[PDB]
Design a protein around this ligand. Structure first.
Ligand SMILES: CC(=O)N1Cc2ccc(N)cc2C1
Length: 185
């Protein structure tokens, strides 16, 4: 891919974070804390899962960013509508306003309904995410494997402003404490 030149500087929005997340001072890294992080509740926070949004909102254009997933066992990445549900249980699907991929139990899957099996030969340490708003496209790239394509959602019906979406995953195993990190341009 040659999407690198649409690079955007993403930062995380503390106000949207699940109350157990710890976001770095530079707002470029997030990890699961071992307890509640002593913040007030608000209507923006994801309550049920270790999720957080980017601060940036996109309603046009082409955008590209990269995320480091080194040594994690579980995570979700992509974009979502600004108006997605925050409270209670929900599935990650385009019908619910999410365009995502994930790692879970040693398999990679795209957040379609039902989910789609991904075929990745080189487990990624960094993921590239490309959004073309006008084209209705969200694509995922394996930066560890020379930028190879992972998955493309096409004919996307965004139906509103988009935000970068992150899930650091639970850490029941003790093997998933590592952060998600936004990689430098
Ligand atoms: C609401 C719910 O079922 N959750 C969210 C959450 C957050 C942190 C921890 N340690 C456990 C759980 C389970």
């Amino acid at each position: 891919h040659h999407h690198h030149h649409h690079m955007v500087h993403i930062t995380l929005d503390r106000n949207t974070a699940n109350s157990w997340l710890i976001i770095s001072k530079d707002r470029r890294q997030v990890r699961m804390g071992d307890t509640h992080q002593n913040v007030s509740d608000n209507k923006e926070r994801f309550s049920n899962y270790p999720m957080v949004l980017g601060a940036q909102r996109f309603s046009s254009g082409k955008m590209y960013w990269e995320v480091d997933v080194t040594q994690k066992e579980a995570w979700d990445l992509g974009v979502c509508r600004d108006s997605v549900q925050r409270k209670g249980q929900f599935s990650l699907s385009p019908e619910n306003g999410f365009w995502t991929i994930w790692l879970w139990q040693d398999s990679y899957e795209a957040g379609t309904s039902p989910q789609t099996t991904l075929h990745i030969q080189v487990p990624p340490c960094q993921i590239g995410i490309f959004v073309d708003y006008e084209a209705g496209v969200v694509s995922f790239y394996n930066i560890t494997d020379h930028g190879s394509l992972i998955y493309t959602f096409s004919e996307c019906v965004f139906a509103g402003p988009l935000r970068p979406f992150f899930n650091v995953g639970f850490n029941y195993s003790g093997g998933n404490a590592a952060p998600l990190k936004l990689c430098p341009l």
